[PDB]
Amino acid sequence: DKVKKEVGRASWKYFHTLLARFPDEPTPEEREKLHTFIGLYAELYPCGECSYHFVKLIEKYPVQTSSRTAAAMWGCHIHNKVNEYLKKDIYDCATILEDYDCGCS
Amino acid sequence: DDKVKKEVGRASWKYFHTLLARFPDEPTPEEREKLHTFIGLYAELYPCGECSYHFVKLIEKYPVQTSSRTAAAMWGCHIHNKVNEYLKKDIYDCATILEDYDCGC
Ligand SMILES: Cc1cc2nc3c(=O)[nH]c(=O)nc-3n(C[C@H](O)[C@H](O)[C@H](O)COP(=O)(O)OP(=O)(O)OC[C@H]3O[C@@H](n4cnc5c(N)ncnc54)[C@H](O)[C@@H]3O)c2cc1C
């Protein structure tokens, strides 16, 4: 439970930062890459029950790849779906883009 | 700024090594291809421009080993050490790479 949670926190941090650095105006190939990436991300997540649940979640909520804004909002919303499932607080997605600076800007 | 980049990197590696350690001991051909495709996208989408370019070149030089989670995890330790080497950081002992990142699942 301890390790599972630590892996989870690290993964979300990476996840949200990745989406926040996606282009504002991606090319068709970049959109496809993000789409393919998310599918594999869900399938390979290092937790059986987590992966099963996430695969089902992205089927209901396909990643929005048209822009950095859409992608980041999508990420916050899907993370909140997991929060709902786990009886955790619902995160305010209002400043999602600013919450995950890459330190690369 | 610099702290952000470090925090994102630490989280990313934690996720990365745990994902590899959770890969099957005996993957199917399709699972091996999924990991191969995933790593390529992981490198291309990393949230830091210079880092992404550097890593893309690294995985081209050191292709991901997908025959088993043992081979994949060892490959992960080796490639992370190449980044350590480039950044003049200490080299991590890979002897217990699987146990180091148990999924706690
Ligand atoms: C893809 C994925 C699927 C998972 N599925 C499950 C599951 O099915 N079952 C299970 O037990 N565990 C699951 N986990 C684990 C779980 O989501 C948690 O990571 C873990 O329980 C630790 O919770 P936490 O309370 O520390 O915060 P986390 O949920 O790990 O949050 C990290 C932090 O990010 C912020 N945050 C919270 N919500 C959001 C949001 N909506 N958008 C942006 N930032 C947010 C907060 O600052 C918070 O402290 C999964 C993790 C991932 C990464």
Ligand SMILES: Cc1cc2nc3c(=O)[nH]c(=O)nc-3n(C[C@H](O)[C@H](O)[C@H](O)COP(=O)(O)OP(=O)(O)OC[C@H]3O[C@@H](n4cnc5c(N)ncnc54)[C@H](O)[C@@H]3O)c2cc1C
């Ligand atoms: C794909 C990727 C590419 C990156 N490229 C660059 C880059 O080009 N330039 C730049 O400035 N930054 C880059 N970074 C960031 C950098 O690698 C570090 O994450 C960061 O500098 C913080 O370093 P750290 O000393 O805290 O430990 P990190 O290197 O983040 O290590 C995390 C921890 O994992 C363990 N660890 C160390 N080595 C290994 C290993 N070989 N195998 C398994 N576990 C290990 C240790 O317990 C350590 O504390 C990248 C990160 C990723 C994830």
